[PDB]
Amino acid sequence: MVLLHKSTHIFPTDFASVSRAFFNRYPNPYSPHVLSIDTISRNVDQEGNLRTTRLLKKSGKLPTWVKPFLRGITETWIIEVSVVNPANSTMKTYTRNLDHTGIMKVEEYTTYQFDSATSSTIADSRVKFSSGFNMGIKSKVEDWSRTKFDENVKKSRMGMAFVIQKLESASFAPECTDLKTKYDSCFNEWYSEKFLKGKECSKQWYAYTTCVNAALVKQGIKPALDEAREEAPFE
Amino acid sequence: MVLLHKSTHIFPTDFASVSRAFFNRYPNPYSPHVLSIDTISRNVDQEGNLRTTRLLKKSGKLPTWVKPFLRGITETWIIEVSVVNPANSTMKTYTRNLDHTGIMKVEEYTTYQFDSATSSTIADSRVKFSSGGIKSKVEDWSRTKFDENVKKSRMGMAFVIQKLEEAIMSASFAPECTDLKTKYDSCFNEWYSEKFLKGKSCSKQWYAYTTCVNAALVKQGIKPALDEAREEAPF
Amino acid sequence: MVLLHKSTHIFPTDFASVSRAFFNRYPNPYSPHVLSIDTISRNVDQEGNLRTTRLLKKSGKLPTWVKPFLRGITETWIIEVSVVNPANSTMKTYTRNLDHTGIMKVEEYTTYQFDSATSSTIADSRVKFSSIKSKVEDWSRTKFDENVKKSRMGMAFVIQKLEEIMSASFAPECTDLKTKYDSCFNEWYSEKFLKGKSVENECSKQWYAYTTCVNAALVKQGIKPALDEAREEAPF
């Protein structure tokens, strides 16, 4: 069963601020379940657009309709894929869960564009919930999905606003966090001062990605992540 | 079965600040479950007192003792009724849930009074839990919920008061109404603080907003329960 | 079954700031479940170190594997024991749950020390969970990861706030007294004790009023025997 939801939020600020905030959105007080975020790949493609894949870990609980052994708190992984076009001031993002996909797959697409008439950045989100099994509890799944969607809409807008206002996070592998911080800082400067302006972090990136990959080898999620990295969600 | 709880909090500030904060208390980082707040009716009565009814939506979970089909995350609607007397610096407020009432009804009365002698505003709260073999469990649940609510109320109000004193908005349940709501609320807030509370005294903004909300409410399952509740006289 | 976890966090600030923040860490937006914190005992010992025992109450839920009547939201009590050596810029802390210990006991030790090479305060934490093995493991790992995050975010929040809304007593009738005591203590702690200038504050009147109130409330609480028992223990 497939359930679709959609939302629009308008940020009263420039595209550059919104996109930077996206890359720095966690941690914030409105997203308590997020535990870590790592950058898996990043490059500027030949067309001049930034392509990034990130991996998030969160705590959470499966719905009450699942088998009892699967109930309770656990950690889940999310892939996040994005493209930024600095010349057109556009961004597209996609997320999906990497685990529990037979029970529930939740995919979210968001596009960001600038409304010059109102000097604001428009974020249009579409979410697809794909539920595996029970039709007998259709209404319940529906209710659940709506509730999840509504919570996510709020968390997204509050968290982004928080970060935007602040501008004016851990690796899943603690031994990589310091390296991540060093890379992220380098990237943030380059992103704001060079890339978005149409105008450098190789050592920091190398150290960090080597650390993350060594950690990922030992993680059960790696095959699922590799598989998802094969997908082309924007195609 | 009826369980009663009471609490008092003293805000070390003036009535105007506390009352304004009440109308703008959400969102705040201490109340993650609140999803929207709408103004259903508002007027100054012939005695000069402000009468307001609002409608809140929250996410939440029913207690573990309910039927398995009812367990899990859901959304609930809350009615909020208030009277403000600016001459006497008093406010009274009442909330109750509109749905799930067969399982649990939770009613809260709060009075706010300015004590000029101690330069403080006293908030006295009373909560009545009316529950439809597991008495001790219901008691524990009610105590815990109450203690959580006391904390969230004082922390959230303090957060908002501090923001207003040193001088990110709430959603409508109907996203197509949120922008209209923001415009109405802005107008009201200015009138409330600068004119009403000072004894010196938004129709277009109100009209557009309320027309939007009512059109959305027609389509909501909660409308009959809301109408019923609006007939009640909690004070 | 015993499950062990460990973590390290480095705060880019001085020992005094980190230690003060520890005693004022709640409330903060990253720890929604904490409902109250009370000081049960405090003294400067003959060696010049601050010995404190505190009692925290939090809301929470037992794991899904417990009997159905025990499921659902509840309140739980935590003991927190600490020692501060201002001369050496060291602090050690210990927490454990006082109730439900037959189901799950969670003990955490944290040490704070100053790394002069990096001008930072190092916090080393070790957690022991004493308890469907895989499910318990998943639960413990998840709880640990959540707690590591809440601790670092909450501490950073409070440190930043003081560099640039108070906690409740479990007994509401004692909160005002607690605030008066805590304020006095805080001022002394930062201005005198951490600077090696005093082993005795002027907070005795505030302490007396507050502790008398708390103890009167504690007599009526089911947790008192468990608290007394835990206070007999010597975690360090």
XYZ file of C-alpha atoms in Angstrom:
706
model
C 0.000 0.000 0.000
C 1.235 3.455 -0.979
C 0.331 6.633 0.904
C 1.335 10.041 -0.400
C 1.656 13.266 1.535
C 2.988 16.652 0.592
C 3.864 19.974 2.170
C 5.353 23.332 1.292
C 7.348 25.570 3.579
C 8.550 29.021 2.706
C 11.714 30.336 4.362
C 11.900 34.152 4.515
C 15.567 34.144 3.572
C 17.995 33.558 0.724
C 18.782 30.278 -1.006
C 22.388 30.228 0.190
C 21.344 30.382 3.850
C 18.751 27.633 3.442
C 21.130 25.242 1.603
C 23.945 25.827 4.113
C 21.471 25.175 6.929
C 20.439 21.921 5.245
C 23.998 20.668 5.449
C 24.248 21.768 9.070
C 20.731 21.004 10.296
C 21.700 18.454 12.949
C 21.903 18.583 15.873
C 19.026 20.859 16.788
C 16.558 20.670 19.677
C 13.649 19.744 17.406
C 15.256 16.503 16.204
C 16.028 14.480 19.348
C 16.124 11.132 17.556
C 19.023 11.976 15.233
C 22.254 10.453 16.584
C 24.794 11.044 13.823
C 25.331 12.212 10.270
C 28.211 11.284 7.989
C 29.194 12.378 4.493
C 29.642 9.300 2.318
C 30.467 10.986 -0.995
C 30.711 14.526 -2.319
C 31.835 16.079 -5.575
C 31.138 18.900 -7.985
C 30.016 17.296 -11.224
C 31.055 18.413 -14.686
C 27.922 20.570 -14.917
C 29.061 22.506 -11.853
C 26.534 21.048 -9.421
C 27.262 19.637 -5.976
C 26.370 15.953 -5.548
C 26.349 14.659 -1.963
C 25.352 11.386 -0.305
C 25.106 11.301 3.490
C 24.222 8.636 6.041
C 22.165 9.414 9.148
C 21.573 7.257 12.188
C 18.545 7.765 14.393
C 16.835 6.126 17.317
C 13.225 5.076 16.923
C 10.482 2.502 17.320
C 8.599 0.479 14.718
C 4.775 0.767 14.652
C 2.738 -1.241 17.171
C 1.488 -3.637 14.476
C 4.839 -5.376 13.953
C 5.772 -8.719 15.533
C 6.608 -8.329 19.258
C 10.298 -9.183 18.890
C 10.688 -6.203 16.535
C 8.913 -3.802 18.903
C 10.783 -1.357 21.112
C 13.556 1.182 20.696
C 16.300 0.599 18.149
C 18.602 2.444 15.777
C 17.855 2.913 12.091
C 19.816 4.243 9.139
C 18.720 6.833 6.572
C 20.365 7.663 3.253
C 20.259 11.310 2.148
C 21.104 12.272 -1.432
C 21.264 15.850 -2.682
C 22.144 18.014 -5.677
C 22.853 21.753 -5.483
C 22.903 24.032 -8.524
C 24.488 27.313 -7.364
C 23.932 29.116 -10.660
C 20.177 28.484 -10.617
C 19.830 28.588 -6.841
C 18.128 25.210 -6.742
C 18.551 22.159 -4.572
C 16.946 18.747 -4.562
C 17.102 16.242 -1.725
C 15.939 12.685 -1.191
C 15.896 10.505 1.869
C 14.872 6.958 2.601
C 15.294 4.413 5.371
C 17.839 1.678 4.716
C 16.393 -0.789 7.218
C 12.851 -2.116 7.878
C 12.065 -1.641 4.181
C 9.918 -4.777 4.011
C 7.765 -3.372 6.804
C 7.743 0.284 5.809
C 9.689 2.337 3.295
C 9.488 6.081 3.755
C 10.860 8.202 0.931
C 10.971 11.976 0.928
C 11.790 14.292 -1.966
C 12.282 17.987 -1.383
C 12.963 20.709 -3.921
C 14.246 24.146 -2.958
C 13.896 27.125 -5.296
C 14.022 30.896 -4.869
C 10.872 33.033 -5.218
C 12.317 36.376 -6.288
C 8.944 38.114 -6.060
C 8.782 37.470 -2.314
C 12.544 37.109 -1.729
C 11.929 33.739 -0.106
C 13.058 30.144 -0.547
C 10.332 27.640 -1.344
C 10.739 24.078 -0.125
C 8.271 21.618 -1.668
C 8.240 18.196 -0.023
C 6.583 14.971 -1.158
C 6.623 11.829 0.980
C 5.757 8.299 -0.112
C 5.016 5.663 2.538
C 5.098 2.134 1.143
C 3.684 -0.429 3.566
C 4.311 -4.130 3.042
C 1.624 -6.343 4.514
C -1.600 -5.820 6.446
C -4.645 -4.480 4.592
C -6.805 -5.443 7.561
C -5.316 -2.515 9.467
C -5.289 -0.063 6.559
C -6.923 2.764 8.499
C -4.380 2.370 11.285
C -1.439 2.512 8.905
C -3.018 5.581 7.364
C -3.385 7.251 10.719
C 0.184 6.397 11.590
C 1.493 7.767 8.345
C -0.390 11.027 8.699
C 0.884 11.476 12.230
C 4.464 10.730 11.217
C 4.178 13.096 8.324
C 2.800 15.894 10.463
C 5.552 15.443 13.054
C 8.203 15.433 10.364
C 6.858 18.596 8.764
C 7.082 20.385 12.092
C 10.516 19.051 12.968
C 11.847 20.041 9.591
C 10.628 23.584 9.671
C 11.535 24.289 13.304
C 14.959 22.672 13.048
C 15.840 24.454 9.840
C 14.641 27.756 11.268
C 16.685 27.139 14.399
C 19.805 26.497 12.383
C 19.234 29.362 9.991
C 18.883 31.666 12.955
C 21.974 30.234 14.595
C 24.073 30.655 11.477
C 22.773 34.231 11.530
C 27.254 16.782 15.103
C 28.741 13.338 15.590
C 29.921 10.623 13.249
C 28.331 7.204 13.795
C 31.922 6.151 14.532
C 33.109 8.232 17.498
C 36.750 7.838 16.454
C 35.855 9.723 13.263
C 33.987 12.656 14.773
C 36.933 14.995 15.218
C 37.987 14.261 11.638
C 34.424 14.950 10.510
C 34.385 18.280 12.284
C 37.584 19.293 10.559
C 36.244 18.295 7.172
C 32.827 19.872 7.712
C 34.318 23.194 8.755
C 36.534 23.255 5.680
C 33.590 22.355 3.482
C 31.304 24.930 5.074
C 33.740 27.737 4.366
C 34.356 26.611 0.822
C 30.661 26.151 0.280
C 29.663 29.608 1.410
C 32.599 31.639 0.222
C 33.530 29.953 -3.062
C 31.005 27.447 -4.399
C 27.734 29.355 -3.992
C 29.458 32.474 -5.345
C 30.581 30.820 -8.579
C 34.222 31.145 -7.557
C 40.307 22.820 -1.097
C 39.454 20.243 1.574
C 41.221 17.195 0.157
C 43.442 16.363 3.158
C 40.607 16.659 5.686
C 38.295 14.699 3.395
C 40.838 11.928 2.914
C 41.447 11.469 6.630
C 37.733 11.547 7.416
C 36.469 9.298 4.630
C 39.181 6.743 5.299
C 38.069 6.619 8.919
C 34.353 6.350 8.046
C 34.906 3.637 5.480
C 37.009 1.573 7.856
C 34.146 1.834 10.337
C 31.484 1.047 7.705
C 33.172 -2.221 6.760
C 32.313 -3.474 10.252
C 28.697 -2.284 10.085
C 25.813 -4.523 9.091
C 24.316 -1.624 7.112
C 27.080 -1.498 4.487
C 25.480 -3.829 1.905
C 22.166 -1.940 2.138
C 24.018 1.363 1.810
C 25.975 0.179 -1.263
C 22.721 -1.036 -2.809
C 20.993 2.308 -2.158
C 23.980 4.193 -3.542
C 23.298 2.348 -6.829
C 19.841 3.961 -7.075
C 19.162 7.189 -8.971
C 16.289 8.733 -7.010
C 16.231 11.920 -9.101
C 16.133 10.031 -12.410
C -12.759 7.501 38.466
C -11.597 11.047 39.138
C -8.023 12.021 39.963
C -7.175 15.573 40.964
C -3.817 17.306 40.813
C -2.804 20.885 41.512
C 0.227 23.101 41.070
C 1.277 26.715 41.495
C 3.975 28.552 39.581
C 5.117 32.084 40.220
C 6.386 34.078 37.249
C 8.733 36.852 38.414
C 7.299 39.330 35.917
C 4.274 41.424 34.982
C 0.793 40.333 33.898
C 1.166 41.757 30.387
C 4.218 39.610 29.682
C 2.704 36.410 31.070
C -0.660 36.845 29.299
C 0.915 37.712 25.942
C 3.225 34.703 26.302
C 0.220 32.457 26.929
C -1.205 33.381 23.547
C 2.156 32.769 21.906
C 3.447 29.843 23.944
C 3.778 27.418 21.039
C 5.986 26.463 19.439
C 8.691 26.107 22.026
C 11.366 23.445 22.483
C 9.697 22.048 25.599
C 6.451 21.094 23.847
C 7.414 18.779 20.970
C 3.960 17.199 20.698
C 2.057 20.360 19.752
C 1.364 20.449 16.002
C -0.930 23.452 15.547
C -2.977 26.154 17.265
C -5.915 27.998 15.748
C -8.095 30.811 17.048
C -11.752 29.777 16.716
C -13.397 32.809 18.293
C -12.310 36.036 19.957
C -14.058 39.140 21.164
C -14.022 41.781 23.845
C -17.223 41.411 25.821
C -19.364 44.271 27.090
C -17.550 44.207 30.442
C -14.259 44.855 28.667
C -12.822 41.353 28.998
C -11.225 39.336 26.197
C -12.963 36.016 25.470
C -11.034 33.547 23.291
C -11.576 29.968 22.180
C -8.699 28.168 20.473
C -8.162 24.708 19.008
C -4.869 22.846 19.430
C -3.727 19.642 17.775
C -1.069 17.401 19.314
C 0.591 14.089 18.617
C 0.678 11.518 21.390
C 0.097 7.953 22.524
C -2.829 6.456 24.420
C -2.028 4.585 27.654
C -0.869 0.956 27.457
C -4.140 -0.326 28.933
C -6.245 0.472 25.852
C -7.306 -2.049 23.184
C -4.365 -3.087 20.950
C -5.921 -1.437 17.888
C -5.934 1.930 19.676
C -2.302 1.699 20.813
C 0.437 3.662 19.061
C 0.969 7.222 17.881
C -2.046 9.363 17.048
C -3.265 12.957 16.935
C -5.633 14.521 19.447
C -7.534 17.782 19.533
C -7.676 20.121 22.527
C -10.046 23.015 23.165
C -8.613 26.038 25.005
C -10.953 28.678 26.438
C -9.758 31.875 28.107
C -10.892 35.152 29.634
C -8.613 38.143 30.235
C -9.554 41.051 32.476
C -7.010 43.831 31.813
C -8.394 46.132 34.515
C -7.854 43.547 37.245
C -4.835 41.853 35.658
C -6.472 38.442 35.792
C -6.733 35.637 33.277
C -8.460 32.315 33.456
C -7.880 29.428 31.109
C -9.366 25.991 30.556
C -8.342 23.121 28.340
C -9.749 19.714 27.630
C -9.309 16.985 25.063
C -12.063 16.718 22.456
C -11.347 13.158 21.331
C -10.591 9.873 23.125
C -12.923 11.123 25.866
C -14.377 7.657 26.413
C -10.915 6.508 27.432
C -9.681 9.533 29.366
C -10.835 13.107 29.820
C -8.200 15.552 31.017
C -9.367 19.014 32.061
C -7.106 21.798 33.243
C -8.042 25.133 34.804
C -5.401 27.785 35.330
C -5.831 31.188 36.890
C -3.220 33.897 36.423
C -3.265 36.830 38.776
C -0.917 39.739 39.071
C 0.295 40.414 42.572
C 1.730 43.918 42.458
C 2.857 43.565 46.058
C 5.364 40.828 45.178
C 5.894 42.010 41.606
C 4.891 38.592 40.369
C 2.209 36.766 38.448
C 0.748 33.725 40.219
C -0.447 30.815 38.090
C -2.643 28.323 39.938
C -3.419 25.139 38.010
C -5.920 22.349 38.726
C -6.176 19.221 36.617
C -8.964 16.668 36.691
C -8.390 13.247 35.083
C -11.666 11.393 34.515
C -11.031 7.776 33.580
C -13.588 5.496 31.973
C -9.032 -3.197 38.145
C -5.911 -1.230 37.218
C -6.404 1.759 39.544
C -2.772 2.110 40.683
C -1.565 2.076 37.066
C -4.002 4.811 36.047
C -2.887 6.788 39.102
C 0.796 6.454 38.173
C 0.056 7.448 34.598
C -1.950 10.497 35.678
C 0.741 11.600 38.166
C 3.478 11.243 35.566
C 1.501 13.104 32.890
C 0.722 15.866 35.360
C 4.346 16.249 36.462
C 5.451 16.361 32.822
C 2.816 18.989 32.027
C 3.840 21.172 34.949
C 7.417 21.116 33.755
C 6.609 21.754 30.092
C 4.301 24.632 30.978
C 6.763 26.458 33.163
C 9.780 25.888 30.884
C 7.867 26.768 27.716
C 6.303 29.875 29.193
C 9.678 31.023 30.541
C 11.243 30.457 27.120
C 8.620 32.571 25.389
C 8.578 35.292 28.060
C 12.338 35.652 27.823
C 12.152 35.908 24.050
C 9.438 38.608 24.282
C 11.316 40.522 26.992
C 14.562 40.610 25.007
C 12.830 41.739 21.823
C 9.405 30.322 14.474
C 5.656 30.774 14.548
C 2.810 28.319 15.059
C 1.024 26.482 12.264
C -2.690 26.260 11.567
C -4.045 22.713 11.421
C -4.898 23.656 7.822
C -1.621 24.528 6.087
C -3.446 26.735 3.582
C -4.479 28.925 6.532
C -1.127 29.317 8.270
C 0.032 32.467 6.493
C -3.375 34.077 7.145
C -3.092 33.072 10.777
C 0.345 34.598 11.110
C -0.950 37.903 9.764
C -3.928 37.878 12.097
C -1.830 36.899 15.112
C 0.651 39.661 14.419
C -2.076 42.265 14.308
C -3.690 40.902 17.436
C -0.447 40.733 19.363
C 0.283 44.401 18.734
C -3.215 45.481 19.660
C -3.188 43.261 22.711
C -0.010 44.628 24.237
C -0.190 48.236 23.096
C -3.899 48.980 23.406
C -6.047 46.366 25.109
C -3.897 45.728 28.177
C -3.305 49.471 28.550
C -7.014 50.318 28.569
C -6.865 52.203 25.264
C -9.242 49.925 23.376
C -7.656 43.452 12.916
C -10.983 42.774 11.220
C -9.679 42.153 7.682
C -6.972 39.743 8.807
C -9.433 38.033 11.121
C -12.035 37.657 8.379
C -9.638 36.075 5.889
C -8.201 33.739 8.503
C -11.440 32.609 10.137
C -13.090 32.023 6.775
C -10.173 29.772 5.820
C -10.235 27.862 9.118
C -13.969 27.335 9.095
C -13.878 26.045 5.537
C -11.225 23.553 6.654
C -13.142 22.637 9.830
C -16.214 21.624 7.836
C -14.081 18.787 6.439
C -12.736 17.647 9.816
C -14.224 14.822 11.856
C -13.689 16.852 15.036
C -16.137 19.637 14.117
C -19.208 18.242 15.911
C -17.191 17.612 19.096
C -15.792 21.129 18.876
C -19.264 22.667 18.444
C -20.489 20.647 21.416
C -17.563 21.808 23.549
C -18.085 25.425 22.513
C -21.593 25.191 23.947
C -20.096 24.358 27.380
C -19.371 27.021 30.007
C -16.260 25.784 31.856
C -15.920 28.887 34.054
C 24.107 -10.313 31.902
C 26.484 -7.353 31.906
C 26.906 -4.963 28.984
C 29.627 -2.314 28.978
C 29.828 0.898 26.966
C 32.272 3.794 27.010
C 32.569 7.264 25.531
C 34.817 10.310 25.714
C 33.874 13.938 25.168
C 36.192 16.919 25.118
C 34.797 20.285 26.216
C 36.765 23.229 24.764
C 36.664 25.175 28.026
C 38.063 25.292 31.543
C 37.479 22.843 34.383
C 35.621 25.383 36.535
C 33.065 26.004 33.781
C 32.499 22.293 33.137
C 32.185 21.441 36.854
C 29.753 24.305 37.534
C 27.738 23.235 34.505
C 27.510 19.683 35.857
C 25.780 20.948 38.973
C 23.438 23.104 36.913
C 22.885 20.909 33.871
C 19.142 20.497 34.307
C 16.803 21.686 33.042
C 17.897 21.885 29.436
C 16.051 21.211 26.176
C 18.020 18.026 25.485
C 16.831 16.246 28.636
C 13.029 16.278 28.543
C 12.613 13.334 30.911
C 14.268 14.964 33.924
C 11.620 16.233 36.368
C 13.605 17.271 39.445
C 17.010 17.350 41.129
C 17.628 17.632 44.861
C 20.809 17.849 46.899
C 20.748 15.170 49.597
C 24.170 15.826 51.143
C 27.150 18.095 50.534
C 30.346 18.863 52.360
C 33.974 19.711 51.863
C 35.949 16.820 53.287
C 39.115 17.114 55.357
C 41.215 16.627 52.191
C 39.570 19.707 50.706
C 37.345 17.936 48.187
C 33.636 18.511 47.611
C 31.479 15.449 48.284
C 27.905 15.653 46.991
C 24.988 13.237 46.759
C 21.943 14.271 44.753
C 18.622 12.654 43.891
C 17.041 12.989 40.430
C 13.558 12.037 39.304
C 12.758 11.339 35.671
C 9.863 10.090 33.593
C 10.412 7.048 31.412
C 9.297 3.641 30.166
C 10.587 0.151 30.927
C 11.616 -1.977 27.925
C 8.910 -3.823 25.970
C 10.015 -7.199 27.361
C 8.692 -6.563 30.872
C 5.354 -7.865 32.162
C 2.401 -5.891 30.705
C 1.399 -4.321 34.019
C 4.863 -2.725 34.267
C 4.736 -1.285 30.753
C 3.970 2.367 30.129
C 5.090 5.737 31.401
C 6.339 6.005 34.968
C 8.676 7.965 37.226
C 12.048 6.644 38.326
C 14.677 7.810 40.777
C 18.411 8.198 40.193
C 21.201 8.702 42.725
C 24.114 10.915 41.670
C 27.337 10.922 43.715
C 30.281 13.192 42.970
C 33.684 14.292 44.226
C 35.459 17.494 43.135
C 39.157 18.194 43.727
C 39.722 21.894 42.907
C 43.482 21.703 43.481
C 43.908 19.002 40.841
C 41.047 20.109 38.578
C 39.432 16.705 38.729
C 35.865 15.545 39.236
C 34.331 12.116 39.406
C 30.657 11.295 39.139
C 28.496 8.217 39.462
C 24.846 7.589 38.798
C 22.542 4.651 39.146
C 18.828 3.962 39.119
C 17.269 3.326 42.522
C 14.157 1.543 41.325
C 13.530 -1.423 38.991
C 17.054 -2.714 39.708
C 15.980 -6.358 39.495
C 14.966 -5.741 35.895
C 17.813 -3.469 34.845
C 20.553 -1.626 36.687
C 22.323 1.134 34.806
C 25.460 2.563 36.374
C 27.530 5.359 34.906
C 30.942 6.609 35.994
C 32.355 9.798 34.529
C 35.721 11.395 35.189
C 36.551 14.981 34.275
C 40.176 16.117 33.998
C 41.979 19.063 32.385
C 44.138 18.456 29.267
C 46.564 21.374 29.396
C 48.100 20.537 26.018
C 44.765 21.244 24.328
C 43.317 23.590 26.996
C 40.268 21.387 27.221
C 38.352 19.344 29.769
C 38.182 15.604 29.068
C 35.105 13.674 30.171
C 35.538 9.895 30.163
C 32.342 7.923 30.698
C 31.849 4.211 31.324
C 28.392 2.644 31.589
C 27.473 -0.780 32.947
C 24.057 -2.279 32.164
C 23.242 -5.234 34.395
C 20.227 -7.174 33.164
C 16.273 -12.165 24.255
C 19.975 -11.263 24.432
C 20.050 -9.408 21.100
C 17.031 -7.288 22.044
C 18.573 -6.298 25.391
C 21.833 -5.493 23.579
C 20.036 -3.305 21.033
C 18.129 -1.532 23.782
C 21.290 -0.915 25.818
C 23.272 0.360 22.822
C 20.440 2.667 21.798
C 19.966 4.024 25.328
C 23.710 4.562 25.652
C 23.974 6.423 22.344
C 20.998 8.601 23.289
C 22.517 9.381 26.664
C 25.920 10.286 25.177
C 24.173 12.754 22.892
C 21.924 14.241 25.601
C 24.869 14.661 27.951
C 27.111 16.480 25.542
C 24.331 18.663 24.077
C 22.898 19.533 27.497
C 26.277 20.348 28.999
C 27.207 22.484 25.992
C 23.870 24.281 26.264
C 24.410 25.140 29.928
C 28.084 26.074 29.514
C 27.222 28.419 26.670
C 24.347 29.912 28.646
C 26.422 30.748 31.678
C 29.240 32.080 29.498
C 26.781 34.434 27.814
C 14.307 28.507 34.350
C 15.710 26.740 37.420
C 15.451 23.104 38.466
C 12.588 21.893 40.623
C 12.668 19.910 43.816
C 10.694 16.658 43.732
C 8.716 18.320 46.537
C 7.191 21.527 45.109
C 7.013 23.101 48.568
C 10.826 22.873 48.693
C 11.667 24.350 45.290
C 11.928 27.988 46.374
C 14.173 26.929 49.274
C 16.270 24.868 46.878
C 16.713 27.801 44.553
C 17.920 29.963 47.408
C 20.396 27.317 48.488
C 21.619 26.555 44.958
C 22.222 30.211 44.190
C 24.307 30.648 47.334
C 26.230 27.481 46.608
C 26.853 28.373 43.005
C 28.309 31.736 43.899
C 30.586 30.230 46.512
C 31.543 27.313 44.316
C 32.766 29.443 41.460
C 34.109 32.383 43.481
C 35.753 30.699 46.438
C 35.877 26.913 46.346
C 37.178 26.318 42.813
C 39.812 29.000 43.407
C 41.111 27.268 46.545
C 40.035 30.124 48.807
C 37.453 28.368 50.986
C 36.402 25.029 52.461
C 33.317 26.539 54.087
C 30.538 28.627 52.539
C 28.045 31.007 54.076
C 25.086 28.960 52.883
C 24.251 27.157 56.126
C 20.906 28.907 56.784
C 19.688 28.252 53.241
C 20.951 24.690 53.420
C 19.230 24.057 56.746
C 15.843 25.317 55.547
C 16.080 23.408 52.274
C 17.375 20.096 53.624
C 14.803 20.091 56.429
C 12.063 20.525 53.839
C 13.441 17.787 51.550
C 13.907 15.312 54.350
C 10.364 15.875 55.606
C 9.139 15.143 52.086
C 11.427 12.101 51.766
C 9.931 10.474 54.860
C 6.689 10.169 52.872
C 8.296 8.749 49.720
C 8.517 5.048 48.980
C 12.030 5.608 47.643
C 13.586 6.539 50.994
C 14.747 3.036 52.002
C 16.366 2.455 48.603
C 18.001 5.872 48.812
C 19.395 5.191 52.310
C 20.722 1.830 51.121
C 22.394 3.413 48.091
C 23.916 6.133 50.274
C 25.672 3.404 52.240
C 27.494 2.320 49.048
C 30.958 3.572 48.077
C 30.979 3.700 44.250
C 34.447 5.299 43.958
